[PDB]
């Protein structure tokens, strides 16, 4: 088999970078592991910066302007909850509420519309010859071994892909802090109890409200990491959640059996550069920020639109050293939103042994950025997401 | 000896008080350990906000401030060999800072007080404070081998971290928030002109340096050093090679050096009690708190603590209102806490902490960036730095 770009995933980034690549022309193939069931199974989050819903309508989908609200943001703590004007503050802005879900199944119809080659169930994929100029990757699809040659491979694979783990160790430097908590998360068929995204920092732990339509609904609360998700029935998730919420919230919240349930695990990650010779790193499989801050799936929006329009370039000006500066250009976006993600954390969830002072300032930080003009515009204008770097 | 207000400490905290109170009619005793040479022997630092400039004024020690202070419109930082400059009067709507050495803060307050002919009485020694929680509170010192007895209806204690009055309340019914940090800041004052008319705090893989001055011919620089060091194993020389390996090449190229008219290496700590008072017995300023001075902020915190104080007793005293005094460290903590919070941001984001690992240290350099280049960043910078508005009292 041969391509122009092999994509190993298709998850959003893949699935994405996909779409942009075919609409200027450039073949890809897109392997992926798991059935395409299996990757519609993932809920994960369900919050758009608008970079990221122009770049869907670009990519050739976002036809579903309804299933998609746009919504603001809110904060509550030590007995208060502070609106964020999100439009006022960041100069028009705003985000939109879409479920990750949606969004694959989105750019998998995309695809599948385009009768653009995806191979589902494609096992033991292994990369090769990445310094060369004919690099290729091998898999397994039902007992053979298949072979994929192409002229660029992006791996857009995740935190477990097998692209990072195929860049030689030492040409690599990670970054890498580990959080003491994870976020069990459920999905409810139920009216959310806001339009507003509801992040609450409690003294019993952070506890996040949001939605995915006016009869769906997604809440988490951070729990520790020796926490098993089956130690936790609907009904103590939907106490604990009550418990660190105002009361006034809390009164008005509609529960329900949940219809998906899983704690995952938090982390801020980055590796520099994220690329090597012909393979090139995308989304999550070169980097990682806690989802406090909503940017996950954003900043992989972000690799996407810069490899696509670097590859553009390149063949267009028959050149590949462009593709150079593809980890820089990146990186420069990345470091922001890993620096807003671990704030937003850092704010808002309660870690292990802390002591008063640690406390006290924690709260401090509340209230400054949620009761000064300056503090909040901080908040808004990263959370609608900063300015779409230069690129090239 | 009675007085009514008894002030513990001669330092600027306690001599503010005792100038507006005696303006005020309130009669007051400050207590000193050392003596006037000594307290004027310690440099600290020099810069003002303006609400302190304004108290200073109101306390009619303000002319000789007002011919020598410099006032600054912004304030600069330099991280990974850039210098930024943050726009004070712009970003935070026109306010600025005043340099102004808190010696000659100190001075001008000793010289009016004595001009007043208010009571002062150095060399105070084993200060000790009596019956707190009832009506007739007093103290007691030891003044060239007698010891005198102060009686009082109130005390002010405003003698520094290492004070008697703190250390005078049942533990037990005082809450510790403290954080100590890993490094001092070694501090050199010279007799040189400034580098800079701006002040340059300065984030470098060597360490912290920062460039301050007192006059166009007095310096005031400062490195971090980790807490084993010793002044004594710091010439004058090995503090200005260390300095200008710390500062932007451009900045070190036209440094005047000279020797230090003193040294010294203040280590760093963030220290809040709460409450503030117990009976009649009321904190202020170091007394109560600490911050690192890394955010210019420990003397007008202690101005504002004082201002309060001083405008609750006029309540109580023109008025009969005493139990007014309850909401004294509930006033003050307000602020207290915001310039906690400044004061550490701005000590994290500017020196090296011993092993950090390397998520760490990028994230650190990505806080510059974004508050040194972001206008509502900036914006948050400025209006901390220039002194987040007074409260409100009551
Ligand atoms: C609780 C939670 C909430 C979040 N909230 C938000 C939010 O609201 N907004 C936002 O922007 N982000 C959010 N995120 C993050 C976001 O979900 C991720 O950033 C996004 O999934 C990244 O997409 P991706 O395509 O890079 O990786 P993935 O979605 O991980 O997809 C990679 C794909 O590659 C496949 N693959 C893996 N290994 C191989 C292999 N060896 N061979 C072939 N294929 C392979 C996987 O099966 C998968 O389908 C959240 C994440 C979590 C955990
Ligand atoms: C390097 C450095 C730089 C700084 N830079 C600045 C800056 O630029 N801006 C700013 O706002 N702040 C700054 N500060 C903070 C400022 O120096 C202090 O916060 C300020 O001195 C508080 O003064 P005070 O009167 O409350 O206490 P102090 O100045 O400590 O005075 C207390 C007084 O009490 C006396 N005393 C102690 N115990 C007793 C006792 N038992 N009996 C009697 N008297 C007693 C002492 O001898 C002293 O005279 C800096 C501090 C340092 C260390």
Redesign the pocket.
């Known amino acids: 088999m041969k391509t122009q770009v092999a994509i ?8 994405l970078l996909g779409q942009l690549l075919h609409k200027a022309g450039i073949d890809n193939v897109i ?4 059935t395409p069931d ?2 519609l199974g ?1 809920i ?6 608008q970079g ?1 819903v122009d770049l869907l309508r670009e990519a050739g989908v976002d036809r579903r302007m309804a299933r998609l609200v746009h919504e603001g943001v809110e904060i509550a703590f030590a007995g208060q909850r502070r609106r964020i004007d999100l439009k006022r503050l960041s100069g028009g802005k705003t985000v939109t509420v879409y479920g ?1 879900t949606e969004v694959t199944r989105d750019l998998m119809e995309a695809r599948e519309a385009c009768g653009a080659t995806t191979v589902y169930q ?1 096992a033991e ?1 292994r990369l090769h010859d990445l310094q060369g100029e004919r690099p290729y990757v091998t898999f397994e699809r039902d007992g053979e071994r298949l072979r994929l040659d192409c002229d660029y491979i992006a791996g ?7 692209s990072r783990q195929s860049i030689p160790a030492e040409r690599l430097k990670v970054f890498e802090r580990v959080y003491p908590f994870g ?1 069990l ?1 459920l999905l409810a068929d139920t009216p959310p109890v806001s339009h507003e995204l509801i992040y609450a920092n409690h003294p019993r732990g952070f506890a996040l409200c949001s939605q995915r339509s006016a009869t769906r609904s997604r809440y ?1 609360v951070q729990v520790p990491l020796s926490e098993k998700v089956e130690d936790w029935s609907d009904e103590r998730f939907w106490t604990e959640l009550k418990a660190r919420l105002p009361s006034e919230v809390a009164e008005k919240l509609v529960t329900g059996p949940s219809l998906e349930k899983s704690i ?1 695990p938090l982390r801020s990650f980055v590796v520099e550069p994220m690329q090597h010779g012909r393979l090139f790193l ?4 070169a980097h ?2 806690p ?1 406090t801050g ?7 929006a972000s690799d996407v639109s810069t490899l696509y329009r670097l590859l553009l370039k390149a063949y267009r000006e028959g050149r590949g050293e462009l593709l150079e500066r593809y980890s820089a250009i990146c990186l420069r976006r990345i470091w922001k939103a890993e620096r807003f993600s671990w704030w937003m954390t850092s704010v808002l969830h309660r870690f292990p042994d802390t002591d008063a002072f640690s406390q006290r300032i924690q709260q401090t930080e509340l209230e400054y950025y949620l009761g000064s003009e300056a503090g909040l515009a901080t908040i808004a204008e990263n959370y609608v997401g900063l300015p779409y770097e230069e690129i090239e």
């Open positions: 190993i995933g298709a998850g959003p980034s893949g699935l392997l992926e592991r798991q299996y990757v993932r994960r989050g369900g919050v758009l910066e990221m990750q494609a994929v857009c694979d995740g935190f477990h892909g097998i976020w998360g988490y995952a995308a989304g999550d499989a990682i920020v989802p909503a940017k996950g799936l954003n900043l992989a």
